Design a protein around this ligand. Structure first.
Ligand SMILES: Cc1cn([C@H]2C[C@H](O)[C@@H](COP(=O)(O)OP(=O)(O)OP(=O)(O)O)O2)c(=O)[nH]c1=O
Ligand SMILES: Cc1cn([C@H]2C[C@H](O)[C@@H](COP(=O)(O)OP(=O)(O)OP(=O)(O)O)O2)c(=O)[nH]c1=O
Ligand SMILES: Cc1cn([C@H]2C[C@H](O)[C@@H](COP(=O)(O)OP(=O)(O)OP(=O)(O)O)O2)c(=O)[nH]c1=O
Ligand SMILES: Cc1cn([C@H]2C[C@H](O)[C@@H](COP(=O)(O)OP(=O)(O)OP(=O)(O)O)O2)c(=O)[nH]c1=O
Ligand SMILES: [Mg+2]
Ligand SMILES: [Zn+2]
Ligand SMILES: [Zn+2]
Ligand SMILES: [Zn+2]
Ligand SMILES: [Zn+2]
Lengths: 160, 160, 161, 162
């Protein structure tokens, strides 16, 4: 009985921590697990394509994926692994700095049995935050960085 | 402070019941409320475009939208109303009978402060259900109907 | 394979609505369902003791209980029913007007596979509300009434003098 | 503006991890934070304390207070309530139930006091379905016996009564 669980949210909301919490619950009950992280985030098997780790993922019962927005094959990999009987758990940004869908990540939602959106704390007014605000001028989607480059931000502070 | 809350799930998961629970909480505390439903699901204003009813939503503090997937202008309405300081609560199918995004509904996710995906009971094996299965052979996306035309199903029963 | 689910929260948080949402999910999939309500609240079987109703409950697959705080035998009934393979869903206040456990209701928590606490809207400042504030001066726990006798309130409004 | 959040669940449900996830969201937004642990639980797997009163002074100088294994502090209710009323956010990870599936100390008295309450889930160590309970493996009868998976299984209803 395979499965896809999706953990959405803005930056700084602890998506990776929730991912690991959920993975460790299985691990402690004797499940073989594998966590996959996006190689190019220079801030678990590193990968740039989920194809490149599919063989390793096949000999495991539970698959965790961090920063799933950055894998071009995220959708098809997850659906294929769940149909093969695996429990697939994905941590991912739902939105870019422009509050648009981050790549193909939202295509997982109609395929998933569980979907949640976490909240961060707004770094500018300290209320609840749902969005990621880019601090710089760069216009491309993929720009790797932490709190030096992005603020987790509420609606009002986003447009401030 | 305006916001968008999204209630996703398959058919028969009680999305519009959760919509009404959330709205009545504000109503009981003396908030002015408006609920919108899709005018063509026959089976509290009906509408085909949210544009047709937006001026009315302006005179209100809390807006509920049922079957949001059927509204082509769902994204711009919810985003504009939330930025005008309204609480917008949307019940909607995340996926079609083919487990694909239903209209533009998922473009709401990166704009939303709250997103949940509800769960139904699988009408075939009686485990937890995440999807909607069309029973007949019609090909088009919009086919109105209940349990005579659709089953809420788990992954395994979907692929039978 | 039985179960207890507990829906907690203050007044006006829609606990009964969420109870019915969960029950109708099973009903629509052709489960036999029964809902039990507290009889001394006249603001779908009425009852004062769950014992009085246990045989009707034994004949269904899913049992809903509204205002579970008022039932002296809430703990033993839910446990007996869940062990007999029933799905038991309980709507109940967690706290009295004094923010104290309401009867034996919290004893369900260690017995339950699912527990949630819902939120209301504060009727005094309109932020999120977790508590039920009594408007009058009656001192007894059980006083039946709606928004004329109680406000859902946040922490600050609860303590406002 | 003060708050009490409660994270319940059986053992192995990752309550401490969820506690740290919530606290770190505040810390990363430059809030002053304090995490308190039960001193007598020395397991491999944060100020140690046996009474929350003993760390009250440190807690007063902080905006966010995390409390791990809240069930073991006798003064859990009055500490959490006083700190929330003083405008602190207090987040508590705790067992709701003992090995007997009874209330664990005073922990449930927090529930009517709390604006947020959740019960987490574990995996059943005996049938691998969802687990809501903690089953003691040995014969000890006293409530407090410190241990991990060597002494307890997270367990579903059916496996509890086997
Ligand atoms: C918002 C945004 C982030 N990013 C990048 C910046 C970071 O390197 C990376 C962060 O992605 P996250 O998915 O937020 O990293 P994470 O898994 O550690 O999340 P969490 O802290 O909640 O546990 O994404 C973009 O490239 N483009 C964007 O538009
Ligand atoms: C899955 C699917 C449903 N539908 C239709 C069939 C129904 O008339 C309608 C159901 O939409 P819902 O949004 O599920 O109706 P609802 O608001 O009453 O939700 P709930 O019962 O959980 O409270 O959508 C399609 O037209 N195409 C599809 O692919
Ligand atoms: C707080 C409190 C309420 N009550 C009573 C007043 C009401 O008659 C009754 C309401 O209990 P509820 O459990 O809130 O009734 P409900 O099922 O309608 O809940 P909801 O609206 O969320 O769906 O409880 C007391 O008797 N004593 C108290 O201390
Ligand atoms: C059930 C039970 C546990 N204990 C003890 C055993 C542990 O030392 C402690 C439980 O602490 P926990 O933090 O609840 O144990 P855990 O690490 O498995 O939890 P989590 O994964 O959610 O973070 O309490 C008792 O003393 N008596 C009991 O009846
Ligand atoms: Mg722990
Ligand atoms: Zn802000
Ligand atoms: Zn099924
Ligand atoms: Zn208030
Ligand atoms: Zn089991």
């Amino acid at each position: 009985r395979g499965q896809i669980q999706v953990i959405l949210g803005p930056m700084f909301s602890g998506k990776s921590t929730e991912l690991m919490r959920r993975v460790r619950r299985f691990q402690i009950a004797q499940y073989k697990c594998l966590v996959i992280k996006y190689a190019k985030d220079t801030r678990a098997l590193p990968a740039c394509l989920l194809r490149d780790v599919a063989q390793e993922a096949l000999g495991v019962a539970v698959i965790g994926i961090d920063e799933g927005q950055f894998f071009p094959d995220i959708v098809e990999f997850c659906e294929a692994m769940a149909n093969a009987g695996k429990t697939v758990i994905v941590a991912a940004l739902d939105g870019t700095f422009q509050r648009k869908p981050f790549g193909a990540i939202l295509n997982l939602v109609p395929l998933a049995e569980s979907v949640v959106k976490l909240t961060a704390v707004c770094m500018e007014c300290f209320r609840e935050a749902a969005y990621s605000k880019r601090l710089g001028t760069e216009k491309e989607v993929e720009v790797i960085g932490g709190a030096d480059k992005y603020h987790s931000v509420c609606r009002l502070c986003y447009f401030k």
